[PDB]
Amino acid sequence: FNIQELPTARKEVFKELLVNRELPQTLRDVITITDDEHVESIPALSYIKDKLATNGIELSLNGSSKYFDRREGHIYTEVADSVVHGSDRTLDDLLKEIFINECVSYETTLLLDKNNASGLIDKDNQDLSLYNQGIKEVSNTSMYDGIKQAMKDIPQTFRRKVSVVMNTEHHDKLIKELAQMGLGTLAGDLTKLFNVSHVVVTDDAQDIFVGDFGHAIYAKYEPIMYNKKKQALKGVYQFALNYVFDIKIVPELLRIVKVK
Amino acid sequence: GDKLLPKTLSKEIVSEPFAKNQLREKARLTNIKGLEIPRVSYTLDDDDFITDVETAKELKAKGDTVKFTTNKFKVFAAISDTVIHGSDVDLVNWVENALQSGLAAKERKDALAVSPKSGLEHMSFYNGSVKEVEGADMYDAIINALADLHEDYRDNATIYMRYADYVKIISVLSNGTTNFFDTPAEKVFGKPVVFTDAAVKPIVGDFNYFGINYDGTTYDTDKDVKKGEYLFVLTAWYDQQRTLDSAFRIAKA
Amino acid sequence: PTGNDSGGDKLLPKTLSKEIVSEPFAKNQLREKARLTNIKGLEIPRVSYTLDDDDFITDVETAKELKAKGDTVKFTTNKFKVFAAISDTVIHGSDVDLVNWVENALQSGLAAKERKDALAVSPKSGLEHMSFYNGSVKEVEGADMYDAIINALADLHEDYRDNATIYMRYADYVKIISVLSNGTTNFFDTPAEKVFGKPVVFTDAAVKPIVGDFNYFGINYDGTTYDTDKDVKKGEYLFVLTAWYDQQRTLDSAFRIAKA
Secondary structure (H helix, E strand, C coil): CCCCCCCHHHHHHHHHHHCCCCCCCCHHHCCCCCCCCCCCCCCCHHHHHHHHHHCCCCCCCCCCCCCCCCEEEECCECCCCHHHHHCCHHHHHHHHHHHHHHHHHHHHHHHHCCCCCCCCCCHHHCCCCCCCCCCCEEEECCHHHHHHHHHHCCCCCCCCCCEEECEHHHHHHHHHHHHHHCCCCCCCCHHHHCCCCCCCCECCCCCEEEECHHHHCCEEEEEEEEECCECCCCCCECEEEEEEEEECCCHHHEEEEEEC | CCCCCCCCCCCCCCCCCCCCCHHHCCCCCECCCCCCCCCCCCCCCCCCCCCCCHHHHHHHHCCCCCCCCCCEEEECCCECCHHHHCCCCCCHHHHHHHHHHHHHHHHHHHHCCCCCCCCCHHHCCCCCCCCCCCCCCHHHHHHHHHHHCCHHHHCCCEEEECHHHHHHHHHHHCCCCCCCCCCCCHHHHCCCEEECCCCCCCEEECCCCCEEEEEEEEEECCECCCCCCECCEEEEEEEEECCCHHHEEECCC | CCCCCCCHHHHCCCCCCCCCCCCCCCCCHHHHCCEEECCCCCEEECCCCCCCCCCCCCCHHHHHHHHHHCCEEECCCEEEEECCEEEHHHHCCCCCCCCCHHHHHHHHHHHHHHHHHHCCCCCCCCCCCCCCCCCCCCECCCCCHHHHHHHHHHHCCHHHHHCCEEEECHHHHHHHHHHCCCCCCCCCCCCCHHHHCCCEEECCCCCCCEEECCCCCEEEEEEEEEEEEEECCCCEEEEEEEEEEEEECCCCCCCEECCC
8 A cells, every 4th residue: 555654763853843942932931741642631630639629629620531632733834946945954944943833823822812712713622712711810900919919829839830921011011010119120030029930921912820830731742744745836845744732721720810 | 351352343444335326237337448339139030010110210310330428527535644644444445435336326326317417418317318108106107118118128128216116006006904015026017126216207128228338447646735635536437328219218197 | 658557447346248248139938838849841640649439529629620630730931031230330349249249139030030920910921820819719708817717728628728828918917916806815926826727927929818738839940041241332241040930739729718
C-alpha cells in the first residue's frame, strides 16, 4: 500500500516545536503543558482536593469525566514560490516562526476571548472559555486594593504560587493610582509590590485574572501528520500540519477581578 | 486477563456491499471495445408469414447494427487522514467496496429514471419509446402486457417491480386471509419475478437484449492537503441499450 | 504518459464475458415427450398388438382410421429454409459472433418451425396433416375448462389414458384454480399433476387443451446441408441451412381436444 508513516525520529522535532516558551507575552510562561501520550488525567488531582478539603472548600466537577478527549487542530500555509525553497536555511527558520506563532495564538483565543461561547470560535471548541467556566467575581473601586482581596481568598496552601494577568490598558492605570498615593519608585516593580511570581502583561486579555495557573490549566499536545505538496500552476507549495489537543481547568483556584 | 476477554475479537474490519444492481442477474454483460451486434438473429424461415409487426417498422427506422457509445462518469471515496494515522484500522478492502458499488447504482439510477437528463436519454426504460398498456388492477395490468408480447419474447419473459406492489395484489387475491404468506411470486404470474424498489411502475420483457458494456477504467490516487483527505477516485465509460422496443413494455393502472 | 493501462480491472466485476453469448431464442416444448429420429426412410406399423379371440370389438374409431389409412405410416420429406444475416461492419469490430451467434440462431429456427406447424390454427396448404387443429379430432364440451379436460380424458381409450399427457397454456390453469379456490385453500402452491391426475406441460401456443398418448406422435430429420455466401454489393455475409422432416400421428383417435 502507498501511504508511509512519518518517521518517528523526525517526530520529536515537532514535539518540541508545538510546545515552546521562548516567546515574550503568553500564558505559556506560567501554565503546565506536556507532550506525553500515556498521561490520561491531571496528574496532581489527588494531592489537590484533600488539601482543599482541609478548608471548607472542595471540588465541584466543573469538568465532566476528567479523562481527556481528543480535539483536533489544523494548520495551513502557502509558501510564496520555489525560490524560497531553492535555498535551505531561510526556509527552515521561516516555518518554525509560523507554527509556534499559530499554535500558541490559537489556544489563547479559546481561553481569554470575549467571543464567549459562540461566534468565531467553533462550537466544537466552545466550552473552554474561562468566562464560560464559572469563576466567581471580586469587585472594588481601587484596583490596587481590589486584588489584595482576591489573592487572599485563595487557599493559603497554594497562595505561595500565584500569578496575575493584566491588560496594558490596565497596566497604565495602577501606576497612576500609585503615584497619587506615592510609591512611584516601587511602581515599575510589580513583583515586589504584590508578592507574586511571574506577573504577566499582554493585550488580548480583557479582564484581570488571579490564581495558581501552574496547577489549573494543564494541557497536552500531540502531533499526527506533516504533509507536503507541489502546486504547479502557481509556484507555490502547500505545507500544513494537523495535530490533536485538549486542556482542562480547575476554577476554584482561580479568581477573576472586575473594577469600577 | 486478555484471555478472559472474549476471543471472537476480529482485529479487522469488513462490510457487505452497500448497494447493488438487480438487472445484472438477467441482462447481458460485456467488456468488449467498440462492440457491435445484430438486431434480429434468425430471419423468417418460410416464404409466407403474418409475423410482420411494429418490430418491422422499428428495424426499418434504424440500422441492423447496434452502436454502443461511450458515456463518462466518476466516483469518489473521501476518507480522512486521522482514520489512517490515529489507529491501525486496515480498511483497505472497505474502499474497494465503495468503488465497485459506486459504478453499480449509477446504472440503477439512469436505467430507471423519470427525467432522462439529456445525454442519458436512450437508456432509461421510462424515456417514452416503450409502450404503455393499462389495466384496472396492478395484477390485471401486468398480465395484460404479457398478452402483447410476441411468442419469441413471451417464452423467456421476466418481470421487475417493487415488492410493495406484490403485497397489495396478493391481499385482494386473498380475502383478508394470511394464506398467501409463502407463495413464490413465480406461481401467480407464471414467469420469474425480480424485486427492486426503484421500479415505480412494472416492466416486462425478454432481457436477452438489454446489454451492457464496460470499455475501460482508470484508477489513481492523490491528497487534498487543506482537508487532509485522500480521494481514491475511479472513472470509466459504459453504455447500455435495448436492442428492440417491442421487447420491453410497461404496465399501469 | 505511457497509456490507458490501469488497475481498475480488479475493481471491475468478475462476471465479464470477454466475448459474446446468449440463450436459446426459442424452443419447442413438444420435444420432451415425442419421439425424435434421424433415419433416412422410416416406416412403422400403427397397431402394436391384438389379443386372443375374446376381444370386445376394437373401438369403432380404430376400425375406421386403420381401414382408411392402412397398416403402415409414411414419413414423407418436406422442405424449408433457415437464414442468418450479418452485416460487414459487425465483422470488423473485433467481436466473435461467427461461432456462437449463428448456432444459437439456426438451432432455434428449427424449433420454431416445428411448433408453428403443429399448433397451427389454420395451416398452410401442403402441410395440413401435421397439425393437431387441422381437424379430424373430436372436440368434447365441458361447462368450464375443468370439466372439459376431465371429460376429454373420459372419452379416449383407457390404454391411451394411462399414458396420457396434457398440454395447455398456463393462464387457463389459473382460471380452474379460481373455481377450485374453495375459500381457504390455495392451489397456487400445488403442482398441476395432482389436480387432473396426470402430467402437464405448459405452452403459450396451445389454445384448446389437447391430450393423449404422445408415445405415438413422432418426428424425423433425414438430411441437411450448410452453406455460406457473401452478397458483395450490399456487404452482408449469409449463413443458411436447410433440412427435410415430417411428423405424423400414428393414430388420430388418440389425441383429443377440450373446449368450453
